[PDB]
């Protein structure tokens, strides 16, 4: 699921891609951490949740 | 407790500082006070 998006995805609009996102100013350039997070997160469907 | 009131708290410069370790949380929100603590952990 998508968490970090520059704007609001348009209606019926599919952001069909997995690109590393860039949060506030700390140049990521392919790394994750300080203001750098991967916008697509695996939820994990455990039926007993 | 460094509780502060009626101050212009610039979170953007602090958040966009690149001289921290963990920002586990801003300038568009105003609050009654900020119970800003201070200590060192291992």
Curated annotation (Swiss-Prot), chain B:
Please give the annotated consequence of changing residue 19 to P.
Answer: In strain: Omicron/BA.1, Omicron/BA.2, Omicron/BA.2.12.1, Omicron/BA.2.75, Omicron/BA.4, Omicron/BA.5, Omicron/BQ.1.1, Omicron/XBB.1.5, Omicron/EG.5.1
Q: What does this protein do?
A: Attaches the virion to the cell membrane by interacting with host receptor, initiating the infection. The major receptor is host ACE2. When S2/S2' has been cleaved, binding to the receptor triggers direct fusion at the cell membrane. When S2/S2' has not been cleaved, binding to the receptor results in internalization of the virus by endocytosis using host TFRC and GRM2 and leading to fusion of the virion membrane with the host endosomal membrane. Alternatively, may use NRP1/NRP2 and integrin as entry receptors.
Subunit structure and binding partners: Binds to host ACE2. RBD also interacts with the N-linked glycan on 'Asn-90' of ACE2. Cleavage of S generates a polybasic C-terminal sequence on S1 that binds to host Neuropilin-1 (NRP1) and Neuropilin-2 (NRP2) receptors. Interacts with host integrin alpha-5/beta-1 (ITGA5:ITGB1) and with ACE2 in complex with integrin alpha-5/beta-1 (ITGA5:ITGB1). May interact via cytoplasmic c-terminus with M protein. May interact (via N-terminus) with host bilirubin and biliverdin, thereby preventing antibody binding to the SARS-CoV-2 spike NTD via an allosteric mechanism.
Name of the protein in question: Spike protein S1
């Amino acid at each position: 699921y998508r968490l970090f998006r520059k704007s609001n995805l348009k209606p019926f609009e599919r952001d069909i891609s997995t690109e590393i996102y860039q949060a506030g100013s700390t140049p990521c350039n392919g790394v994750e951490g300080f203001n750098c997070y991967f916008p697509l997160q695996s939820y994990g469907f455990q039926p007993t949740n | 407790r460094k509780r502060i009131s009626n101050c212009v708290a610039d979170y953007s410069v602090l958040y966009n500082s690149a001289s921290f370790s963990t920002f586990k949380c801003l300038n568009d929100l105003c609050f009654t006070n900020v119970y800003a603590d201070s200590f060192v952990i291992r």
